[PDB]
Each structure stands twice: as structure tokens, then as C-alpha cells.
Ligand binder design. Structure first.
Ligand SMILES: [Ca+2]
Length: 113
């Protein structure tokens, strides 16, 4: 269970469950950053980024996705750390899902506004 996290503080670090040890199978995590309008969240991935991938199909197993307003970043998977995100928004949703197999260390991000 890792759904429904709500953060109203302007700074923080968020990680996949158990990071940097492997995240659970069948994860459905969600984290919402809810700040006053006018604040603009910037997000950066840190340290090891390792989400299961596939050689031909883009992120079919596990992935992180970020939404703010109408804008969507990702899904992201694999070993490459996504580029930093300037969301231009005060209300961000970070979603992570995993399937029922594999072994990958997950992700770490920090945010500021
Ligand atoms: Ca997996």
C-alpha cells in the first residue's frame, strides 16, 4: 500500500518503496504535491534510477509518470535518469506502477518550490 501520499511542504525527497532495494511487485504508488497557486514545483531525479524496461516496447512493465495540469512527463523506465522537470505548477501528481516480476532498485526524486 503506497497510494494517496499528500505533501504540502515546499521541499521534499520521495522514493519508490524500499529504495534503493528492489521495489515491491504489483506496486501502485501515488504522491501528490499540493502547494498554494503561484508556487512552481521543480523536480530532479537523484542517485540510482533503475526501473524495469523492454528492448522493443516503451515501458510496458513498470514506470513512473508525472502529471501537472494538462502536462504529462513520462512514462519513464530503464536505467537513465530522467532530466529535471520545471513543472510550472503548484499541483503535481507522481504515479508509479510495477508488474508482478523482476528486480530493480527504483527511483529517488527531490522537489522544491
Ligand atoms: Ca517489474
Amino acid at each position: 500500500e503506497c497510494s494517496g501520499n499528500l505533501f504540502t511542504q515546499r521541499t521534499g525527497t520521495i522514493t519508490s518503496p524500499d529504495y534503493p532495494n528492489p521495489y515491491p511487485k504489483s506496486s501502485e504508488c501515488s504522491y501528490t504535491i499540493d502547494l498554494e497557486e503561484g508556487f512552481m514545483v521543480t523536480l530532479q531525479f537523484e542517485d540510482i534510477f533503475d526501473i524495469e524496461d523492454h528492448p522493443e516496447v516503451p515501458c510496458p512493465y513498470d514506470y513512473i509518470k508525472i502529471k501537472a495540469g494538462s502536462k504529462v512527463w513520462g512514462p519513464f523506465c530503464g536505467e537513465k535518469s530522467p532530466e529535471p522537470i520545471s513543472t510550472q505548477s503548484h499541483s503535481i501528481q507522481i504515479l508509479f506502477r510495477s508488474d508482478n516480476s523482476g528486480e530493480n532498485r527504483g527511483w529517488r526524486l527531490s522537489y522544491r518550490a
